[PDB]
Write a protein that binds this DNA or RNA. Structure first.
Length: 172
DNA sequence: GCCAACGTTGGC
DNA sequence: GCCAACGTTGGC
């Protein structure tokens, strides 16, 4: 079995150090080759999850910190972890003065859009299922989306990934 | 290396 | 705009 991931981005506008960190799935889809590099991860637990990712592994594009937060679509990894250049750019939002270039602290991956979900899967729906499965022993009982609330890159089990995909087929 | 004092994520 | 959950920093 392969690994599956969840990766958060903010679709609504918000300024960090004067610059817009907005990146929706529509913004990915508009990209050249619908491909971008996933810069600006500055959490050690999360960076390590990037380092664990492999060519072709799928990931949910989660929308966070907006009016309707939830999973919007699928993308896959097209380039494994490598140095994030933005940590050395002096005025960049995600600049890190303690990062030296002989061994760079922070990593990023390249991701490519695959598809939208048949429908948006809001956080609130996910949360009902997660609370319910704590009682019923179902597939979202240990989902990282709710067990580790401040983590932008998350592993998912086969169980969890398939369950999210089955919700896609149901009525809202 | 502990742990008060911050600093940040991100739902609500 | 509020603030809980979770992370980092630095005096001791």
């Amino acid at each position: 079995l392969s690994s599956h991931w969840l990766m958060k981005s903010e679709p609504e506008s918000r300024l960090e150090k004067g610059v817009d960190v907005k990146f929706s799935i529509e913004d990915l889809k508009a990209q050249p080759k619908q491909t971008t590099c996933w810069d600006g991860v500055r959490n050690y637990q999360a960076r390590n999850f990037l380092r664990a990712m492999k060519l072709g592994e799928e990931a949910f594009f989660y929308h966070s910190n907006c009016k309707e937060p939830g999973i919007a679509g699928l993308m896959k990894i097209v380039k494994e972890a490598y140095p994030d250049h933005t940590q050395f750019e002096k005025n960049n939002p995600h600049y890190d003065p303690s990062s030296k270039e002989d061994n760079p602290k922070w990593s990023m991956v390249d991701v490519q859009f695959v598809r939208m979900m048949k429908r948006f899967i809001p956080l609130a729906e996910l949360k009902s299922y997660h609370q319910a499965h704590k009682a019923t022993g179902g597939p979202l009982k240990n989902m990282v989306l709710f067990t580790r609330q401040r983590l932008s890159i998350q592993p998912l089990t086969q169980e969890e990934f398939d369950f999210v995909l089955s919700l896609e087929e149901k009525e809202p």
